[PDB]
Amino acid sequence: QPKLLNCQLKEYQLKGLNWLVNLYEQGINGILADEMGLGKTVQ
Question: Which of 17, 36, 39, 40 is the most exposed place for a label (fewest CB within 10 A)?
Answer without folding.
Answer: 36
